[PDB]
Write a protein that binds this ligand. Structure first.
Ligand code: STE
Length: 268
């Protein structure tokens, strides 16, 4: 007559496999190297080729097409909007989340989505580049660094986080619970029912702790390593939001999608 934490871990894992278009196994199959392989974007010529095949509407404007860096930033935003949608459905699997007031669900998602986005982005990154466009492109790290300022400054800190995060050798069963724990933080600004959220957090962190003990017997500090990664992600998001605001203030063509503007509004 006690909670079955192994079963809860498996429920979370299954919800992650159901709700995210990309997972670490799917990404590794593509990254390893037969139908619809990814188109490699390593320079301006190959960016423009990939756009004409994969996001044709975006470059169908002739002289009116936006600057390459702004088109890339638009594609970044579309990826975030999609991952926010996936995370919102995933959160229903977290015990207690759907029982919270709607406003608290919104606040938890507001602060958690970008931390989760950058954690999961590691799964599609290697030291040379990253998968994009639903696994149909591979854009190089060097190409992103070559963009004009400020756009070359977006992805590099995310690659740096990801190289260390990937060295932990988590699998999707671990990442799903880490993402659930990110969403359940009782210290987000403006929460109403802090007490119930703290209990929700305690519960999911307990599931995570036991799962890591079982799945990674070789790494006895993996749980505190991941607690630190959560703090690192909060700081990565704070810095990312500051850069997005610079882009907003200084780049008139880099229209910010209204869902993301709402996420960033009053965030940090
Ligand atoms: C076919 C053309 C492909 C162009 C691919 C551009 C790269 C996509 C990167 C996806 C990850 C974006 C992470 C940064 C998010 C920045 C925007 C935001 O704040 O939501």
């Amino acid at each position: 007559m006690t909670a079955d934490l192994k079963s809860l871990a498996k429920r979370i894992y299954e919800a992650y496999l159901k709700n995210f278009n990309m997972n670490k196994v799917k990404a590794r199959v593509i990254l390893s190297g037969s139908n619809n392989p990814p188109f490699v974007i390593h320079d301006m010529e190959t960016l423009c080729m990939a756009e004409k095949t994969l996001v044709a509407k975006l470059v169908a404007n002739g002289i009116q097409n936006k600057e390459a860096e702004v088109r890339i930033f638009h594609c970044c935003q579309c990826t975030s909007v999609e991952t926010v949608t996936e995370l919102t459905e995933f959160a229903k699997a977290i015990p207690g989340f759907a029982n919270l007031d709607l406003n608290d669900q919104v606040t938890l998602l507001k602060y958690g989505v970008y931390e989760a986005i950058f954690a999961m982005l590691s799964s599609v990154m290697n030291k040379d580049g990253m998968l994009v466009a639903y696994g149909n492109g591979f854009i190089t790290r060097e190409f992103l660094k070559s963009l004009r300022k400020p756009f070359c400054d977006i992805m590099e800190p995310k690659f740096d986080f990801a190289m260390k995060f990937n060295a932990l050798e988590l699998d999707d069963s671990d990442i799903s619970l880490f993402v659930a724990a990110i969403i359940c933080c009782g210290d987000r600004p403006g929460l109403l029912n802090v007490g119930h959220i703290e209990k929700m957090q305690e519960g999911i962190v307990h599931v995570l702790r036991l799962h890591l003990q079982s799945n990674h017997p070789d790494d006895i500090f993996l749980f505190p390593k991941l607690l630190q990664k959560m703090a690192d992600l909060r700081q990565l998001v704070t810095e990312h939001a500051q850069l997005v605001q610079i882009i907003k203030k200084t780049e008139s063509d880099a229209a910010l999608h209204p869902l993301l503007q709402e996420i960033y509004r009053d965030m940090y």
